[PDB]
Amino acid sequence: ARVTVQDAVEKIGNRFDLVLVAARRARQMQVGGKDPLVPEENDKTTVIALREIEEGLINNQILDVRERQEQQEQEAAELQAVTAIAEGR
C-alpha cells in the first residue's frame, strides 16, 4: 500500500495534476491497453500508477509523448487501408 503520496507530489509539483496523471495512467493499466512499468506487488492499478510516478518514469510529458507516438503507430498500420478510400473523389 502507499501510505503517503509525498514522493509523487515531489515528482510532479501541482498535486492535483498528480491525481489526474496517475489517474490516466492507472486507466491505461485498468482497462488493459498496457502493462506496469514496475513490479506489481498485488497493488491495484491505483497504487501501481503512483509507484510509477515516484520512480519518475511516468508523468504528463512521458504519457503525452507515448500516446502521440501510438497515433502514428496506428497510422502506419492503416496507411494502405485509408489511402484505398480514394473513391472519395
Partner 1 sequence: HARSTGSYSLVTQQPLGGKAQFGGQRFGEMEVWALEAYGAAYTLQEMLTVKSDDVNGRTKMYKNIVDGNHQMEPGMPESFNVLLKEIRSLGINIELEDE
Partner 2 sequence: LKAQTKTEEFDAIKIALASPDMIRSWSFGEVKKPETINYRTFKPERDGLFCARIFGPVKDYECLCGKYKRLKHRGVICEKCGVEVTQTKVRRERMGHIELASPTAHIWFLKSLPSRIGLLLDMPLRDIERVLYFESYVVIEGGMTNLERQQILTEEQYLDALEEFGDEFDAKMGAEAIQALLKSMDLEQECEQLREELNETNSETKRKKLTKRIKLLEAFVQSGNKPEWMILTVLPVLPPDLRPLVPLDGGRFATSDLNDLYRRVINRNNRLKRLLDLAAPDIIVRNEKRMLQEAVDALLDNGRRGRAITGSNKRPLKSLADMIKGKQGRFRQNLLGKRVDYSGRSVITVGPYLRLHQCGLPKKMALELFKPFIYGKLELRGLATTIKAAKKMVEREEAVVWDILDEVIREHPVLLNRAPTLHRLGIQAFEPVLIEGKAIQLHPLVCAAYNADFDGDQMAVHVPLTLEAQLEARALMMSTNNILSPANGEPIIVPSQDVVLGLYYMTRDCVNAKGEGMVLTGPKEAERLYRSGLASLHARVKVRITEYEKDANGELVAKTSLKDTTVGRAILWMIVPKGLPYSIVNQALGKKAISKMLNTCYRILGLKPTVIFADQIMYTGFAYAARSGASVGIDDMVIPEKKHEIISEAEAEVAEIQEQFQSGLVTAGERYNKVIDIWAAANDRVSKAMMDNLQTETVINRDGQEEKQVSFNSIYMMADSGARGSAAQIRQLAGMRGLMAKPDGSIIETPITANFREGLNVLQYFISTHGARKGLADTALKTANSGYLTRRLVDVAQDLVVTEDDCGTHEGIMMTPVIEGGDVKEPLRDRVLGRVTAEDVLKPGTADILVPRNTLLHEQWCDLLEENSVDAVKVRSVVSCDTDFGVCAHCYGRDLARGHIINKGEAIGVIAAQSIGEPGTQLTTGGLPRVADLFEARRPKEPAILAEISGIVSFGKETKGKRRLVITPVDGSDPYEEMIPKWRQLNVFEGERVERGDVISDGPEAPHDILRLRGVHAVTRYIVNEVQDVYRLQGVKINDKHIEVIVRQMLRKATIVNAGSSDFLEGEQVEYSRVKIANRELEANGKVGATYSRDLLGITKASLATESFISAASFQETTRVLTEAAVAGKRDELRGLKENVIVGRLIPAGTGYAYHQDRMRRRAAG
Q: Which residues contact 7 (CB under 8 A, 6 or more apart)?
A: 54
> Of these partners, partner 2, partner 1, none, which one is at the site of residue 49 (CB under 5 to 8 Å by kind)?
partner 2
- How many Å apart are CA 77 and CA 66, to the nearest integer? 17
Residues that bind partner 2 (CB under 8 A): 1-6, 8-9, 14-20, 22-23, 26-27, 30, 42-47, 49-50
Comparing CB distances to partner 2, the nearer of 16 and 87 is 16
User: To the nearest 10°, the Cα dihedral for 49, 8, 17, 30?
Assistant: 10
Q: Which residues bind partner 1 (CB under 8 A)?
A: 15-16, 19, 27, 30-31
